[PDB]
């Protein structure tokens, strides 16, 4: 079945979007239809996976004869799925026998006839709390358009026999013929591997039917649903023949246009007008300058002065294609915390053709760019900062990518004076350098690294997280790994690389509880018991 997501213009758009529809994936809204302008623009639709909004319809008759079940994935305002209001004489809603979620509203329909006699009790399901049907089993159009009372367990509208393989509309989903309460699970747990595995028989969920693959432009979500587009907290990633909604790693890629190219083409700096157009942005395409005029405010460009607290919007920037030349920062801030999370400055375009990460004439105590790892093309000039102390420490040869990259770090706070004032790297830092006066702002860690922070030593033997060192970094062990005092508590990551298990141990892996009732191979639920040795034994 084909599925679908001026008065003349509205009618044309609705006829284009609902001519061939059989199951409506979103909400069917039939609103603002001119008189004697609709003619069978939508009659084959049989499943509305949302809300039916028939409002302000001047046309005399909207057929909607084939719509059997309106699911209720949303509501008009609240518990409002069928919205017949402010409209029309005959609406032969013949096949609609059940609306699963929501209620039907009747109001401001003086012209509507024979709809007041329809037994709405069967159509609505337990959502009578908002059943405002105030504006005999027959849907109009004389005879043969009867309400077909059937209600006043995977079949919603009605049954064509006492078999789940033959039902009009499935209650939750239908794999191919049988109405299943859930899709064939994507991951199946195998007692041999003691872990969930991708089941060949598992199928993704596409609306109200289980599909082995999601056709057209449909993305498989985490919960197995095949949504049209990935959510805000997810990203589109193709690993197999079907793309999946990969969860975003912090801020997801939202390539904005930088100052100089695009909407901010002729802008001079990051003015208050230019700001707030870069919120929740990463991989800013172009340069991203902060000239003094941004802080002062300008008249000939009619830009109000930028409050210092508004520079924190840029914190999400994880890359810059052009040059990131920050020539004036608010003096009340001691470190360039605005660009703290920057990771790579590709430097495709260079300020004056030379500099790619220039911080000139600021009053910042420390550069504060802890996350910066690569400055690809241009050179780097960090001068004029009379209070920058932890500056020359960082090995400028390590971060740069091109051999021609230089460094002109001069005129900052004296290194002799930096050491005299106690402004030196915290002892837990490798000789590569230090981005700031704190352990977190360390170019490389001397012994271990609990994340960005560089600790003296991981909790190999004693500690609350009980890390297990790996690649000169501390990784918090799996929660089931009970801490061990005689030796380390876990060889590596995962629940199967731990010596002592706080909870029960299932095969090689240590889990909170034994697998009980989980779906396994051959569509059989798996239940496992635990012995005195915390070993999870399959039943």
């Amino acid at each position, epitope marked *: 079945k084909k599925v679908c997501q001026t008065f003349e213009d509205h009618f044309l758009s609705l006829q284009r979007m609902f001519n061939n529809c059989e199951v409506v994936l979103g909400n069917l809204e039939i609103t603002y239809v001119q008189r004697n302008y609709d003619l069978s623009f939508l009659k084959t639709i049989q499943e509305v996976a949302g809300y039916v909004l028939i409002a302000l319809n001047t046309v005399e008759r909207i057929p909607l004869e084939n719509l059997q079940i309106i699911r209720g994935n949303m509501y008009y305002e609240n518990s409002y799925a069928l919205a017949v209001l402010s409209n029309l004489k005959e609406l032969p809603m013949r096949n609609l026998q059940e609306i699963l979620h929501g209620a039907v509203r009747f109001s401001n329909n003086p012209a509507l006839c024979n709809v007041e006699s329809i037994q709405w009790r069967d159509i609505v399901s337990s959502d009578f709390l908002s059943n405002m049907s105030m504006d005999g089993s027959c849907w109009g159009a004389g005879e043969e358009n009867c309400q077909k009372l059937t209600k006043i367990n995977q079949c919603a509208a009605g049954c064509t026999g006492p078999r789940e393989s033959d039902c009009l509309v499935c209650r939750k989903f239908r794999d191919e013929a049988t109405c299943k309460d859930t899709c064939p699970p994507l991951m199946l747990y195998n007692p041999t591997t003691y872990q969930m595995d991708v089941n060949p028989e598992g199928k993704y969920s596409f609306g109200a039917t289980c599909v082995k693959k999601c056709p057209r432009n449909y993305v498989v979500t985490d919960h197995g649903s095949c949504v049209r587009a990935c959510g805000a907290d997810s990203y589109e990633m193709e690993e197999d023949g079907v793309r999946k909604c990969k969860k975003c790693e912090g801020p997801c890629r939202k390539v904005c246009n930088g100052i100089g190219i695009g909407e901010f083409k002729d802008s*001079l700096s990051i003015n208050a*007008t230019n700001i707030k157009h870069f919120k929740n942005c990463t991989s800013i395409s172009g340069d991203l300058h902060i*000239l*003094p005029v941004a802080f002062r405010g300008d008249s*000939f460009t009619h830009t*109000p002065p930028l409050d210092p607290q508004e520079l924190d919007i840029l914190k999400t920037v994880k890359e810059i294609t052009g040059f990131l030349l920050i020539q004036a920062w608010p003096e009340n801030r001691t470190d360039l915390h605005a660009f703290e999370n920057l990771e790579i400055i590709r430097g495709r375009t260079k300020q004056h053709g030379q500099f790619s990460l220039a911080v000139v004439s600021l009053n910042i105590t420390s550069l504060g760019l802890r996350s910066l790892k690569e400055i690809s093309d241009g050179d780097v000039i960090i001068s004029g900062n009379k209070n920058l102390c932890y500056a020359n420490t960082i090995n400028w040869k390590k971060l740069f990518g091109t051999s021609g990259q230089k460094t002109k770090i001069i005129s900052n706070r004296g290194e002799n004076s930096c050491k005299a004032t106690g402004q030196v790297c915290h002892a837990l830092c490798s000789p590569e350098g230090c981005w700031g006066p704190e352990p977190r702002d360390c170019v490389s860690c001397r012994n271990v690294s609990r994340g960005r922070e560089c600790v003296d030593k991981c909790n190999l033997l004693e500690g609350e997280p009980r890390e297990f060192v790996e690649n000169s970094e501390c990784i918090q062990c799996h929660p089931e790994c009970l801490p061990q005092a005689m030796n380390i508590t876990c060889t590596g990551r995962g629940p199967d690389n731990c010596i002592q298990c706080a909870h029960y141990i299932d095969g090689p892996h240590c889990v909170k509880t034994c697998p009980a009732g989980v779906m396994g191979e051959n569509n059989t639920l798996v239940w496992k018991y635990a012995d005195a040795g915390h070993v999870c034994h399959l039943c």
Partner: single-chain antibody
Amino acid sequence: GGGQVQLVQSGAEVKKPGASVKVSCKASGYTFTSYWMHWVRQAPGQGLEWMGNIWPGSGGTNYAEKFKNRVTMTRDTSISTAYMELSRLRSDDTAVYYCARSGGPYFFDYWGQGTLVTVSSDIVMTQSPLSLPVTPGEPASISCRSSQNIVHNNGITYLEWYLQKPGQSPQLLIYKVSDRFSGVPDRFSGSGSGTDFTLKISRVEAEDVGVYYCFQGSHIPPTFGQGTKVEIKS
């Protein structure tokens, strides 16, 4: 102790019809690359008229439609001096061309000395008074009317009044529709809203003599009014 922002122009230019003149403005005491050097001209018998800016940091100029094809402005960041070359000198170009410096909340804050380039062979704001004389101590008031509403989309009104005291380049008096700039006594106190603006001097003193030009910049090309040459009745 912070360097007094003092822009100095070339000055004393006399040319012939159809010629080209280039005037510079040596900017000193300020980072010449952090404030636009907007250039304004005041013809004899006419008020201030913006002649387009140049942002000395990048050299990217804007320009005035009345000179879009005649005047080019270029920056020289090394010497901290902007330059403005007006080509095809006509009879009506003989005037005094000044170099402003558009500040934060006020345009043409610190103005240069001014160059008299004598060559010989748009929201319209009208100032209601003109050569309105007052008595020493007697309060005076000049009203100014705009062609349209001078309320910018940003919500800030870029209306101002510059008091070119006799023999000096204009100095901002009312930075915004109401605010008075620093260094100006409380005697000057403008008012207005919508499209009507009037400046009320609390007590016309000896120093206040000089043509108070009212400028509106909330439109693209900022335009100044005719200016009321307030003079002592006595």
